[PDB]
Design a protein around this ligand. Sequence first.
Ligand code: 2KH
Ligand code: MG
Ligand code: MG
Ligand code: MG
Length: 1826
Amino acid sequence: MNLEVLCGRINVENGLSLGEPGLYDQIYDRPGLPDLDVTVDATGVTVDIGAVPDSASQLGSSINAGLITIQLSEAYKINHDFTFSGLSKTTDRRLSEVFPITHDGSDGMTPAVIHTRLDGTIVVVEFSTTRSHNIGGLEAAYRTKIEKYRDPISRRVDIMENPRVFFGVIVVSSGGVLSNMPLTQDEAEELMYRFCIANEIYTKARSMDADIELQKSEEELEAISRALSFFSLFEPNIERVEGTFPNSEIKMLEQFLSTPADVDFITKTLKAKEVEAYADLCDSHYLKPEKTIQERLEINRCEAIDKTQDLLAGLHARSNKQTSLNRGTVKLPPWLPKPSSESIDIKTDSGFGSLMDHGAYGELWAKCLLDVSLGNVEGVVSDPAKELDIAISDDPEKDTPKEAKITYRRFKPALSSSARQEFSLQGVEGKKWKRMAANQKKEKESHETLSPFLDVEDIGDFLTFNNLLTDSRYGDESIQRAVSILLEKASAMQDTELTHALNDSFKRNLSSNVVQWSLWVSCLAQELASALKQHCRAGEFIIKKLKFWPIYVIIKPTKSSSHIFYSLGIRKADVTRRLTGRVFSDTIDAGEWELTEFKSLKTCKLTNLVNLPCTMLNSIAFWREKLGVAPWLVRKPCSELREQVGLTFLISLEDKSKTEEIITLTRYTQMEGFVSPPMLPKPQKMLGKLDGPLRTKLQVYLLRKHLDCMVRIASQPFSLIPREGRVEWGGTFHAISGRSTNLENMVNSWYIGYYKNKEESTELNALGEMYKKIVEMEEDKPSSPEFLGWGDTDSPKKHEFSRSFLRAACSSLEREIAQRHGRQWKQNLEERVLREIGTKNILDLASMKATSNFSKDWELYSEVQTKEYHRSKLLEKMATLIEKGVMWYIDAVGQAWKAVLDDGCMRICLFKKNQHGGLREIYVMDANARLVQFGVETMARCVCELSPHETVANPRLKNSIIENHGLKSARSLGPGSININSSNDAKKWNQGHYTTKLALVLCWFMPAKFHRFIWAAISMFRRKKMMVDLRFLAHLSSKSESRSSDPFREAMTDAFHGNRDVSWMDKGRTYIKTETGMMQGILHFTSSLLHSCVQSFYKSYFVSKLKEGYMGESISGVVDVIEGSDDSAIMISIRPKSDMDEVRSRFFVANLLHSVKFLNPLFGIYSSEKSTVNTVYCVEYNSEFHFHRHLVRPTLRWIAASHQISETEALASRQEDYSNLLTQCLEGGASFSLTYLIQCAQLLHHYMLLGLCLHPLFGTFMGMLISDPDPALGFFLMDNPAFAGGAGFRFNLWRACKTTDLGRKYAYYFNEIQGKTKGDEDYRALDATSGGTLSHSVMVYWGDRKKYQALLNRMGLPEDWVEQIDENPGVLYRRAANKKELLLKLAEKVHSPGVTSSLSKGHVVPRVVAAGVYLLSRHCFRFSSSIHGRGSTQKASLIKLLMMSSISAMKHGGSLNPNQERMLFPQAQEYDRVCTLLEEVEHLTGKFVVRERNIVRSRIDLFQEPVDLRCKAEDLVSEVWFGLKRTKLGPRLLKEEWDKLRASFAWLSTDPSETLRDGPFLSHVQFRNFIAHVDAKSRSVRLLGAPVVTTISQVVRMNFFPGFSLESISILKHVLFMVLNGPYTEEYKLEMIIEAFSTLVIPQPSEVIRKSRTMTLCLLSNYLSSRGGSILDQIERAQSGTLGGFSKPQKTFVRPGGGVGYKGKGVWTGVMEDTHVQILIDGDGTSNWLEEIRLSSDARLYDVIESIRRLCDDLGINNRVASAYRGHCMVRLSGFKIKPASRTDGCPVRIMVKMRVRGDILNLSVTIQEGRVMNILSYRPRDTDI
RNA sequence: AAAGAUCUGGGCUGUGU
RNA sequence: GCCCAGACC
RNA sequence: ACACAGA
RNA sequence: ACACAGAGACG
Ligand SMILES: O=c1ccn([C@@H]2O[C@H](COP(=O)(O)NP(=O)(O)OP(=O)(O)O)[C@@H](O)[C@H]2O)c(=O)[nH]1
Ligand SMILES: [Mg+2]
Ligand SMILES: [Mg+2]
Ligand SMILES: [Mg+2]
């Protein structure tokens, strides 16, 4: 590389330009490393570098062989010196000899390079190296090198004339280069290679003599020393290990590391597997006897048809063989009553007698209404006047009844025995009627599965033809009016035309039939959730009415884990409309009434019904966007929209696991359509996963449609369409409906099953399947151990593997690791591992996760049957270990291993994961096994960190390998390359891994001193005792005989009862014993290491095979591999050069990507049928779908989770949670308008959770909210429709403060907080007070504090932990040293609000849903007394809090002043900049465009963190107070940074006690928390779109809607853009601009209070015409342009040469945007600086400040000099940034004509002083003007 | 009830009388 | 760092 | 000591 | 009505 070319290829502008940091990955093929011969003879270090081994990439050609000497005192800098030798042969250059002499302390600072071009451009280049392995280390080094030199260079820039400085940085690591230089890829690769040799030299020189390196920290040495002592003195008693655990002989390990791999066996096995794979490929894809593709596709169709017919027949043979029944998919009636006025009364008169003679349900309803209309049911008529009196009660606890709720709306009907029988058939008091014959027969029939040939055609007709999307004409009813009022009040913040259009679209969606139905269904679900706690005696029912609808419900509650029964009733006159379709359950005709049979719902099933309206609204909006229909368009629905919305409806309502599982499998069924020749699609491979019981009509319908999809795929693959430079696919369709659609629509339809609720509760009879999943794998254990680590076999069975192939895979991975990290990688790995193990603390293991309490005392069921098993928290065990005195993980793991070995097993307990896509069992260890597992997983993570393609330990490799395959193939093969990929998954990954293989793989890469620990610690995995549920085992114990078609159920019964002997269960035991398999994710990283080894072997083998060729000549190819845990992908790129060679090369590559299935069992890995093999131009990895240059992300996945019912306790934290959910929908691929509609649904959800459909006082509450829109009191804030979900909740809170009456309330809160002293009541620090603190002032608690208090009483922590921390503050800044500091840190952890709220709350979603009946009127909210004031009691209702705010906080006059706005919202200036950028899109105007299909992830940075400190204030305070070298600065820079900290906070001192007694903080923990957050935030949103002050504008324009662009004078703009960018000179350009302003006509200007380019053009149109008169008056009235002049000119002086300087105290006075501005400036002969800013008003401070920045930009005045004025102002300006008025490092801000063309700049200006020109108007042409 | 991990974002019968 | 949420294994 | 180097 | 190739719940 060359420094001159690299520095001369930079485009530099005036002033200092940092640029943008670019990242370079190690992509290109690398030659072998040269030979190194390092000697240390104490006369320096002599390295004998040999020649680079022969290759052809021109990489490594900068390394010259021969002797090199590097002195001992210069040998600690080798990595820096050798890497950059050739880029910069020199060493350093001071700033004194290139820059003007400043008199700071920085004149002696030496950046690596200071280059100077011929014109005068200066490039300051800094070099850096890091030995880290992640991007974080590169970012840290880049940031510290920028921080060290940015400020002094800028100070020198101030005093230069015509300066152009860049200041680039290059940071080099092993696998990355981070630099803002325009480096080529080859230069970065060369730097990485040179760094590899340099680090090899450095490691060798350190190994030979230990004084080359530098003295490292005491803590690092102690960590390394304790780790070394542990691993040297650890004796696991391997003889006892062998006698205790199966196959634990260490002679296996000794043989594995010393016996080389059997080369002949490997070659013979590889040939045999090759011919077996070829035979399988030829037989199963019909390649011989050489037919055409049509005939082979027909044979594929016939095979698929036959196999699906076998499936259907086998499923029918075990069913009840009924071809017709009446069983509704939807258990709710299709009623659409017109909504009525708010009422929850049960007023009923007259007709009861006709109801009596209409069956059992008519009898029940008539008796209920008769009892209601006689006064014997309490609370039938609500009183929203006494409830208000309770709500406004100044004295709770005395005027709220306690015992009224006992008889609330409860009636006890005297039903006949026939009616009780009928109701018991539905489960209503069904346990008592269990032995009656009808109940027995119904129970017997309930277990029978359904036939696949069942008539299900009402479902298909409903899906194609329904009235779900018809307008209901209910748009002016009460629920609509309430939601509309709340939405319009929220939208008054951004009351524009876009807001109105999107609100109208939302309200049209809200007025559809399905949403109106979902609204009352959600209200019914909320009433049932309320009835959960409303206990009923025997025979007692509850009668309720829905608030907005004439619907009555009779409810029978049970135990809260058991069922809720309900019956519905309406008047037939009240049924205005109905939902069409035959998917609904039949109702009952009862004369005047329509009734509903008793249906059941559990707690988990309620959620989907609660969220149903938001689900349906979001589905309608999403599928309208995906069909290309704009939100602002009225259009009748097509068949596809009806099908999608109806399918979502049915999936949400059925809420069953098999239903969503069938839909989930369609993804793997339909991915076979991308399989390329010479292979055919085989979607019939999924037929094994569709075998299972069918229990609903929808399951039958979905299975049949899935099988039709499978037959369709098997006969016709998706077609390739390459047209211009992209690859498109044709023939895609929805799997369920069958209708043709886009690729993205098919991918999204693969996730419709996600609408089923994950959080179901599993029943006891469903719990045995888990045990079944564990047993047959253990039953497949080989009876002989010869192929479990000892020998070699070519035909391994289950759990078996061959030693030679495992060793060869380890060798291959070791070769790749030695290529990347050098030949001394293991030496550095040892130091890394010892550091990690010795540093790690016991409190680091004190997590919030559960642990197993299973032990020897729980093993025998006869001693346990009366007990209840409970898991513990790991925090308890770790706290017990800390109290006893253990402080390091080293001192605990020895005792943990001793306890495990004495136990002889590992103790596990089980549970079932709540997941989509099927069944997964989950294992929980006890604390001893966790302590042992932690060390081996640490070592495995450290090894996986070194792998060049393992993605679990290297997150960037999730993407970089896939998207760098194109560059690598383009370099190696040229253009026009064919890419063939395979995406592979493994079958039962954790269950198939015998842990001896994992131990051998891990011990291959670790140094021998760890081997004794690794072999023993994994050995305990070969005897695992797994506790089963005690209730399941209790029901099993009472049934010694088995009546089941499942063999496992009988086997388990006999094993527990002793009737048979099996290896996994003994008689009368509570556990299953298992030897095979790791557990789920327990040995995650070592299994990733094994898979990395295997795929490294595959890559090497594929490369060798491609080099061999098919008939002798090599195939040119590029092979890439990527690995997860069991997930893998292989990418092979070829260029065949002709048509005839292309067929042969593709056949060869298909054969290579067909034998992975056959080579995997040699490593104990089994290919899953979820693997998609041999697909051209497309690859999938961890559900990331790369379809050539189209990255497809399933947006429906995140849209389905956008309205989670939050468990949070603060009211505004609900809106923060909603915003966090919204951002993920935005990043998942949704447009901005879709995100806004999703937020409208979130608003509806939020007000439902506040009691919109429940509380009779919600109207009063809403009326109070209109006059007080406080988010802390429940007001939902809506986003700007053009940028929805992109800014966050704090930005919207700042907008609400700046716009609504929340500013007055926050100003009052600020004044009340500022007025108190430290000893005062309700005092809090104003410095630690932000807008988020004020919004978090109202809370409601959901958990039980008694559980948390009992947990505290079992831990023994000191009560005066705050005082003991105050005695020793240093405990809050570094690790503990003794028992005392660790106990203090533990007590600090457990008393944190997050830990307390986590250990208090369990599952509280039903309580949150049922709180809607009492949040408004009952005193359950705790409020901050520092903010809301002392109340009469500690708790209040929401209406009470609104009145308290209405009498105190709303009386305060005046909004926030700029100082308060700056303190509460530190990022307010960036907020205002973005908000100004957002107000140019206020109208729905634009054009429909082409979507262009090129889609990629791209990050958008906004609200960027300003430049204040070099380091974090945490580290600076730590270093100054306690001597910890947490920063990277010398004493001069450390003192300089401490000066800026003290400038920010004058009370800060070098003594912690002085700061504690002089600051605003009562305790020192509070100061630690405050100093943790001095730097506020930095927000970046990762959009998914076109391959990109400017970028925000583009994404706002191009992402409002897919295929839409949101936009005489514009013709003038189009002319001027080509004029100012054209190849002309100033003379020729000046003519036709005047000509264009003399031809075209421009509207006359007006008064605007924002920046408009149009009226700026109008002003120059009038200037060139001189119509009105003086141009200055026109500009003054139009209020666009800086006007004014110097009221005190500076003394003008001649600089040495040709420059002109100023020295006096000049004063500028003028107007900038309707504001009188007086600027005071000074000078010293080198620069000029601001002294004071005087403004007559602060209404538009931010715009005025930006105008001052532009005014000082061209006048050469800098805001870098601090003023000595210590008086009072409103704000201070430092670097043209607004600061709080208490700051002491900026200037105070206090209250009180010719036209030119610069470079592509068009300005109107006037002279101000001699040798000084200032602008008035500027217009910059933009690329969007054409 | 909620294991081992990776990313990204954020935070620091209270019952309807 | 700690806690929370979502997605992924 | 200043100025360098930085898992 | 929920669960389930009849292992449970319906107090
Ligand atoms: O929630 C999870 C998901 C995945 N994993 C770990 O990731 C492995 C692969 O995750 P997987 O989703 O492929 N399931 P797998 O066990 O392979 O069976 P199959 O359905 O046939 O593919 C699993 O074997 C676990 O070890 C977890 O530990 N926890
Ligand atoms: Mg340097
Ligand atoms: Mg798998
Ligand atoms: Mg997987």
